[model samples]
Target: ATPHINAEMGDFADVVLMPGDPLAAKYIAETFLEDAREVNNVRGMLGFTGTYKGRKISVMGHGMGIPSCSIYTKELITDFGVKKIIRVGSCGAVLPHVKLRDVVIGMGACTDSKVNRIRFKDHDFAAIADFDMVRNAVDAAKALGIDARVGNLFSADLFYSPDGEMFDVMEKYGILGVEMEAAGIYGVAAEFGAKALTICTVSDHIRTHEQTTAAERQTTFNDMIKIALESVLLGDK
Candidate 1:
């Protein structure tokens, strides 16, 4: 009985793709999924369930920030029995070497958010993706001939940082990119014993101040999406 999801029991597939933008969810459903149907539209956050490669999969938007993404992922795991949640979203490259349109598989996430500190009593909780999922994505990327970077990411609660020192530290530590939601989702997955992974297309470069067009943001990363879906299916096999 989640407030955000209106779908009944069994409406959601065991595997779900979560994008930050609702329109991205729509694009994934319409462009990649076969025989897709709208399952939830609560609060204008779209969700659809369909088949990919004849295997059932669902795609949904988790909204903008950490709190918003956590709500949907938590409910999907605890209430709807979703086994895996794969975040297919965009990120800004933090390290100078990372380029736009390159894919990143978030093996670990370091967050500047206070939520985990509170939950762990001021201790750092390691938010990381499942190992098999990570390995599968890498294998799929190699098979697909896409060289995806696998590394740690920084998940900031704020899109605009007031302190420039934070970016400097992130760069020094080799953080691949900055995004809004992966840490929270990974934390929730750990809390509830569910599997989670985040695969992002580098849409912006922080060092060069370069960014992708709106059209590119929505339409790019089909290969990353394929890796995510294939990873889940391969895990089942």
Candidate 2:
């Protein structure tokens, strides 16, 4: 077990589904995983391991923002020997046509976080999703009859930015939505040679100022999680 995760070495699966909220992780495990067992709750970053379709799988919280996600991703790679990590979370849509509850498969992540800059010698690092994971995710969504948007995502350091005009530029760039962790997750995956993908539901609209309840963010959404699970399951194909 590493510092953040207190589970035994073998407690985690090769693949992990990460939610930004620990309570969200708890809900996913209880709702989808069969015979799930608690593995880690250190710092209330809850984690669980169990079977999905009789295959090993784990769910855990990575917390909010780039730094929190980066810390956990690095530890999972270097200490627990995880091979693939998928972020299952929610995003605020920037595209006018992208409605609430619309799903997004992150192909590339643009970030305002300085973490990627420091890692790349103060240069730009193009954080991108694992192509296999992206393809698998699209196939899974198609199989599920959901028309998920596949596009670039923006990761912001601040949720309540005073520079509100940034959304205009993001829309011009065709950014699908905004989340806090994808850029950091992609960077960590690239650095450590683990596969990563982010699939998020449009829980809010940036332009419209419409949003989901806190309860909705923590629990009650099911479609995105199903797509996350099936993306890995599609690997057998």
Candidate 3:
């Protein structure tokens, strides 16, 4: 157990699904997993472990932004013996072609955060998802008939940025969407030698101003979760 997570050893499963909001985590546990039980609630950041199609799995909230996400991910990997973490969260579509409610599997992440720079002597570190997991997710999506986009994502430190040009620049570079945690999570996974992937629902289209309802963000974003779970099962096999 770490400072944010107060749980016994073996409380967490080898695979974890991390969302940015604790409420979303709770919803996923109650709605999807069978025989689910709460394992940790340190600072009201809820966590649960349960069985999904006979596979043991865990889901927890990592909070928002780079610093907050980095702490939880590192602890999950280093202290709780978690091997794989798939971040199932929301993102704002950066490109006009990427519509709201569309799901994206983050192949790699480009970040404006300084966490990697500080860790790597002011040099850029490639933050990428585990390849096997990425392929598994894509295959799962194909089997489920979900039209999913698999590509690069931009992880921004600021949700409300002062520089408007940042979006255009990222869009030009083929960033699918903008989110808060993927790059940081990938960085921690790399540092700890654990596998990580991020699959996000496009909550809003930045250019078109199209958005999904909050209800959709929390409840109807089930396809991404299914893909993540199936990917986990595939990786185990």
Candidate 4:
């Protein structure tokens, strides 16, 4: 029994939307999907199943770092038969090119987390999103006329790094932004043959102090979510 999830079998859909903040999950459910129900409330990490545009979908919170997201994602895939994991989360921009509240459709994820080495037994693993999902997300953003960029991102366990210049080097190397969980999720998706992508809204910028307002954080960045739902429901071609 997972301590944070009370979900058993058949409590989830094939594709799920995961956010880092539980309240954001709750807000999405309450504001967008109809007839949402609290499927899992253990440890305040909420999970809900609802319909978006007349199609069944699941939206939930994966909590904060890679490990926490990995646990929930693993359980949903292995136990609940989920096939796709779309992380609708937030990140800090590494460059001024991606401003606060801008969306990033992650194509590939680079990580400093040792989880991959642990799994691969010292082989370097490049965790990446499913290509179809990436294309669909980009298309959706284009359709919505939002400024969305598709690029590589970084995932780190440490939020406040003592090694300050390391991230600057990452940006110089082509990292668009930094988030906490996507790489692990992508790795697990590969292991289980499931689809995974992370659509991130820049909450705060690394190079700038600009941050997303609370209202914007809650529901204004719907482009990412809409794309995830469309990709899952309409089959991204």
**Higher-TM-score candidate of 1 and 2:** 1
How well does model 4 score by local distance difference test? Answer: 0.83
After superposition, the stretches of candidate 3 with alpha carbons farther than 4 Å from their true spots are 214-220
Off by over 4 Å in 2: 211-220
In model 4, how many backbone clashes occur?
A: 0
List all candidate RMSDs to the true structure.
1.4, 1.9, 1.3, 1.8
**TM-score result, candidate 4:** 0.93
What TM-score, over all chains together, does every model reach? 0.96, 0.95, 0.96, 0.93
For residues 1-237, write the lDDT of model 1, one tens digit per residue. Answer: 589899877889999999998988998899899999999899999999999888999999999988999999999998898999999988888787786778899999999988788778898899999988899888888887877999998899888888878988998999987999999999999889999999998888776776467776654578778888888778888
- Which candidate do you rate higher for lDDT, 1 or 2? 2
lDDT score at residue 93, model 4, on the 0-100 scale: 82
Ranking by TM-score: 3, 1, 2, 4
How are the candidates ranked when ordered by lDDT, highest leading?
2, 3, 1, 4
- Decide which is better by lDDT, 3 or 4: 3
Q: How does candidate 3 score on lDDT?
A: 0.89
